[PDB]
Design a protein around this ligand. Structure first.
Ligand SMILES: Nc1ncnc2c1ncn2[C@@H]1O[C@H](COP(=O)(O)O)[C@@H](O)[C@H]1O
Ligand SMILES: *P(=O)(O)OCC(C)(C)[C@@H](O)C(=O)NCCC(=O)NCCS
Lengths: 116, 459, 516, 76
């Protein structure tokens, strides 16, 4: 599942509810999850390293671990400047295959952790 | 609608391909085999293939190229056959204007077909279509194989009659022609033992079956000569000599053939029979059953050139009594019949309406009349339809009874006239062979009608 | 001077296909090269070798090295520009089968643009006496009109290097340092229009897929091809003029109608390359460089309108969005990604419909007209191009293998061709609405045709007969007790009489609110 | 549709299914897949499903207006 088909919040049951006429109760399910709904600083060394890189790419404040490359300046051209900066920062073979399934700074920090 | 959708839904037999392809295959497979039989001489597939491809290379030398178009105006014979295959193998579209046709009608078409070359007995580069001798084209280089075409390109532009005032060119794609042909080849099982008879003039699309049907199946297209264009005695000899199995004609031409007694004119080689393009007299299978072979297998077929060679087939072993015309049977595989009202909505069963022909057998349109094409072809939620102006009706078993035309089935100072019932009632006189009727010129706009006697030959 | 030998930025669309080499880029991992295959009889490999490396030395863009999202030009590249395969030595059928190995490879190939190899001519000399002169050009170097300029220069450089008229001196970087900055007010002024529309732009054309576009590691392009005849072309052109619309607008409209008919949505983005020449030098029609700007045409294709309306509409939409094209499709889609909406135009309409012939006359004469071709455009499911071939017109649909359902681009194209000559052969006051491909609609008429097995009767009629036939037979079983047909029937008929007594009568409605 | 409009028999599941499909439309009844404009969409093209033919319910009882939005009439 790519990004817009993530359950951007998620839930579970022992057994799905059943509608009067026997269906899975997708009405009740949607509305229960609806009622069950009702950024933060760089703390990790990988988050700081990404903020050094991302800010040097974007020229704009990456004061946030929940920063999203897409909304900040999502371009695949700028992803080359990011790729080069992190390829220098850690000696890792970063690429868009890794990055664009994990496009937020706290999600990408997990890729720096594995040093590959 | 369920029944009629089953019929119109019957799937394509189309090996969707350039119309000529299978003859060039059959020729590469058996150059020795009889493509054609003629006045006394016969032509093999190898001869015809090389002759046609020499004409094609002559045509590319003459600047004819993919889907440009060529008048073909030759005496019936191997020169005519090699000419149309040579136009088609130039990747070009042939415009048959059979040479019996007067120069007056031809001259309307010489511009209207957009026809950038002509094939004739004659070289004359100063003619309106620059005009070329079939024999000097036969002196051309061979194209070693036919020019490549995808099937949707134009294959032929058969021209409708001068009755229209300005003739229209029915531009048929290879896909449309070959869906029709394939869809019929599969019912006829046309094979190496078969020999067709081209009683067809070339400016009439039964010839397109005679050609690419017969020769694509490797069956031999037996040719009358040009001076044999209505010579039923030569046709009878041809059936008996060149052993014809697959008669194909308008029914008047088979009435012309059956006018000759069986002892003089042995048809017992006819394995199956195709009748088309005009009313089959109900009794005609009844007359034909003793004359053609055992397993007589008449097929009566329907529809204009705007839906390929045909769009229907009714098999006849014998007439079931309630037929008042031999119906269009089922629509042919991959093509369809709607019957519509005037307002384009489909009519219910047994209601007379206009016939709309649909699907994988339709002509491109008219060769340079997109404007009239938008009237005679239409597009619905059900896709493309050729508006025949024929009148007809479905039956409860989905059989499609034929009931004349929007012309002919007209008012005359009052009530609608069933002129087919005028024909039928004059044919219900004893001693009538056929009958006909019309509506006339002058301010009175009168009805008119015509009789023909039967003679009953004797010794 | 953004001097001729310095590293310099990629022009807008050059970035798009440059990033299209990225292995994880959406349907990336590929060149964006055109591969051309010609046929000709017997042509000198020494003239060809000399011609290829002539046009490289004449035209700096054909020797451009690509690294780091920028282009730097090699004075002469390290890698040879002509792939001579002098196979006059082979047997013919071995050479053919081995040509298929070379063909697939070269035609799908990621060309070595890092080593200056944007342009790669070649020739398999087939021992059938047929020189398959071929041409892999990465469109990174060149606009496809600039590819016919490459053909113009090659045709001359083979025929007579003496007739090579001028080294066309305006350097592509100096043109970019001009034209991009020159248009930059119009880039912002259009960026306004695009920004203010980013939610209101349509989607990608929602065609059917057997693989989602990110989920194949190499888009093997399959070309689908149809040479419209010289005469079909004339009829399109007459009708185009009679409706006041460019021939490119006609093929574009028609394509947008097909794509609409095959999309889940009749509104979608398709990309149009605009082969821009609005720099004042007359040799800008002569420099062999990527002057393309890419236009994000948001086409919106109603039913029920005539084709004449749909094309006049499509032309207004094309000519209007051309004003807004000074902000490039690339930066619009980046702006949509910056808005967090992943729009794209992964389908292209490349109308190379200048009047001269696509292959220019010199090259047609030297070898032959175009025999076959492929476009390896990245991020694009379906790269539809058009080319004048003879005085006819080649329709190319450079689909991607396996991305679509098998047979779909074939069928959808056979329906496109069918439409484009329904536009030759019937006036455009006809409905814009296509037929379905008849074989599909015929299958569906069979499915929908299945006879009513309905012995049409009131819904109870069977049961009250089954009851009269076998009154003791079990009809219902419950927690232990069971009801025979006769019992259920007599009970139901007592209720029925109770209901007529209660003033209920036929077709009037009765709530039933009973535990099972 | 009344109770139904299809029968996909399932002796065994072929590997190209992504959901169990609606089978052949049931005897006496039919489906179209259609555009927003109601014109039928090609094979594999996703569109709105319309049910037709001799199994159709009459309408939403005392609601004629939803019945004219949710039930429609064509030359088909
Ligand atoms: N079997 C037939 N019986 C009666 N009319 C026919 C028959 N076959 C074709 N026609 C129709 O009458 C005209 C003859 O065909 P055509 O010369 O192709 O235009 C067209 O209007 C046909 O649709
Ligand atoms: P990046 O942010 O620089 O590029 C991302 C992209 C969304 C523009 C890209 O993935 C894409 O969809 N490219 C389309 C390329 C195209 O249509 N090229 C046609 C060349 S004529």
């Amino acid at each position: 599942l790519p990004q817009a088909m993530r359950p951007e919040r998620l839930w579970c049951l022992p057994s799905l509810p059943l509608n009067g006429n026997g269906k899975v109760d997708r009405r009740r399910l949607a509305e229960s999850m609806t009622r069950a709904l009702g950024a933060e600083e760089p703390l990790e060394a990988h988050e700081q390293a990404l903020a050094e890189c991302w800010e040097a790419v974007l020229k704009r404040p990456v004061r946030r671990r929940e920063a999203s490359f897409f909304s900040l300046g999502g371009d695949s051209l700028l992803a080359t400047r990011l790729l080069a900066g992190i390829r220098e920062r850690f000696g890792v073979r970063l690429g868009m295959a890794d990055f664009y399934r994990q496009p937020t700074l706290a999600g990408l920090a997990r890729h720096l952790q594995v040093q590959t | 609608q369920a029944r009629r959708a089953l019929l119109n839904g019957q799937p394509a037999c189309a090996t969707a391909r350039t119309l000529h392809r299978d003859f060039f295959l059959r020729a590469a497979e058996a150059p020795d085999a009889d493509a054609l039989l003629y006045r006394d001489q016969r032509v093999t597939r190898g001869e015809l293939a090389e002759r046609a491809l020499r004409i094609a290379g002559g045509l590319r030398e003459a600047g004819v190229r993919p889907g440009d178009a060529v008048e073909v105006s030759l005496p019936r014979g191997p020169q005519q056959v090699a000419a149309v295959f040579g136009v088609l193998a130039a990747g070009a579209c042939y415009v048959p204007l059979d040479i019996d046709q007067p120069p007056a009608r031809r001259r309307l078409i010489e511009e209207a077909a957009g026809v950038c070359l002509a094939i004739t007995e004659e070289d004359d580069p100063q003619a309106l279509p620059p005009r070329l001798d079939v024999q000097r084209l036969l002196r051309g280089p061979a194209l070693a194989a036919p020019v490549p075409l995808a099937p949707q390109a134009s294959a032929y532009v058969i021209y409708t009659s001068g009755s229209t005032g300005v003739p229209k060119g029915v531009e048929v794609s290879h896909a449309a022609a070959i869906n029709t042909i394939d869809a019929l080849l599969d019912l006829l099982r046309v094979n190496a033992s078969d020999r067709l008879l081209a009683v067809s003039a070339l400016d009439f699309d039964l010839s397109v079956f005679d050609l690419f049907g017969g020769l694509g199946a490797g069956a031999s297209l037996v040719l009358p000569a040009q001076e044999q264009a209505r010579d039923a005695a030569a046709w009878a000899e041809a059936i008996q000599r060149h052993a014809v199995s697959l008669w194909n004609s308008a029914p008047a031409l088979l009435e012309m053939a059956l006018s000759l007694p069986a002892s003089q004119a042995d048809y017992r080689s006819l394995r199956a029979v195709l009748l088309s393009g005009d009313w089959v007299a109900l009794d005609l299978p009844g007359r034909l059953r003793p004359r053609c072979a055992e397993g007589c297998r008449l097929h009566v077929l329907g529809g204009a050139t705007e839906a390929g060679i045909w769009s229907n087939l009714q098999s006849v072993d014998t007439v079931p009594p309630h037929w008042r015309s031999i119906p269009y049977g089922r629509p042919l595989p991959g093509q369809a019949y709607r019957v519509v009202d005037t307002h384009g909505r489909d009519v219910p069963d047994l209601v007379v309406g206009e016939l709309w022909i649909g699907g994988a057998s339709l002509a491109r349109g008219y060769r340079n009349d997109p404007e009239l094409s938008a009237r005679r072809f239409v597009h619905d939620a059900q896709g493309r339809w050729y508006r025949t102006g024929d009148r007809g009706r479905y039956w409860g078993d989905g059989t499609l009874e034929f009931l004349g035309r929007v012309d002919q089935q007209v008012k005359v100072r009052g009530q609608r006239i069933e002129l087919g019932e005028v024909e039928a009632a004059l044919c219900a006189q004893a001693g009538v062979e056929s009958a006909c009727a019309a509506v006339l010129g002058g301010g009175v706009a009168s009805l008119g009608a015509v009789l023909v006697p039967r003679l009953a030959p004797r010794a | 001077a953004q001097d001729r030998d310095q590293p310099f930025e990629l022009s807008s669309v050059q970035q798009a296909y440059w990033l299209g080499r990225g292995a994880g880029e959406v349907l990336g991992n590929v060149s964006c090269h055109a591969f051309l295959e010609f046929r000709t009889r017997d042509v000198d490999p020494q003239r060809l070798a000399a011609a290829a490396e002539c046009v490289r030395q004449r035209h700096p863009m054909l020797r451009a090295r690509f690294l780091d999202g920028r282009q730097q030009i090699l004075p002469t590249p390290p890698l040879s520009c002509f792939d001579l395969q002098d196979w006059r030595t082979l047997q013919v059928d071995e050479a053919e089968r081995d040509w298929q190995a070379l063909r697939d490879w070269r035609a799908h190939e990621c060309l070595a643009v890092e080593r200056g190899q944007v342009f790669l001519l070649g020739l398999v000399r087939m021992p059938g006496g047929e020189d398959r002169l071929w041409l892999s050009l990465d469109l990174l170097a060149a606009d496809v009109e600039s590819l016919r300029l490459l053909l113009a220069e090659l045709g001359v450089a083979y025929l007579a290097p003496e007739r090579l008229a001028e080294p066309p001196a305006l350097h592509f970087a100096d043109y970019l340092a001009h034209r991009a900055a020159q248009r930059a007010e119009a880039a912002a002024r259009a960026r306004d229009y695009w920004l203010e529309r980013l939610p209101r732009l349509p989607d990608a054309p929602a065609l059917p897929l057997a693989c989602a576009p990110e989920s194949i590691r190499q888009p093997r392009t399959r070309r689908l091809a149809f040479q419209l005849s010289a005469g079909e072309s004339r009829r399109l052109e007459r009708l185009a003029a009679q409706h006041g619309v460019t021939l490119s607008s006609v093929f574009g409209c028609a394509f947008a109608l097909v794509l609409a008919r095959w999309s889940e949505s009749a509104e979608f983005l398709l990309n149009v390359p605009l082969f821009d020449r609005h720099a004042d030098d007359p040799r800008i029609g002569e420099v062999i460089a990527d002057f393309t700007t890419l236009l994000l045409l948001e086409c919106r294709m109603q039913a029920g309108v005539s084709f004449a309306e749909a094309v006049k509409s499509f032309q207004r939409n094309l000519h209007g969005a051309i004003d807004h094209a000074a902000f490039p499709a690339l930066e619009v889609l980046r702006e949509a990604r910056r808005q967090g909406q992943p729009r794209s135009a992964p389908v292209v309409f490349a109308s190379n419909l200048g009047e001269e012939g696509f292959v220019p006359a010199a090259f047609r004469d030297a070898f032959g007209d175009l025999h076959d071709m492929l476009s390896q455009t990245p991020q694009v499911w379906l790269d539809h191009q058009l080319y004048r071939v003879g005085d006819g017109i080649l329709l190319a649909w450079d689909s991607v293998v396996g991305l679509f359902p098998e047979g779909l681009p074939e069928t959808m194209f056979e329906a496109y061709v069918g439409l484009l000559q329904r536009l030759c052969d019937s006036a455009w006051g006809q409905p814009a609405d296509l037929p379905l491909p008849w074989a599909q609609q015929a299958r569906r008429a069979l499915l929908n045709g299945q006879p009513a097995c309905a012995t049409a009767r009131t819904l109870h009629r069977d049961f009250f007969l089954r009851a009269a036939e076998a009154p003791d037979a079990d009809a219902l079983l419950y927690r232990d007790q069971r009801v025979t047909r006769g019992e259920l029937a007599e009970r139901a008929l007592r209720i029925a009489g109770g209901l007529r007594e209660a003033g209920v009568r036929p077709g009037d409605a009765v709530e039933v609110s009973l535990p099972r």
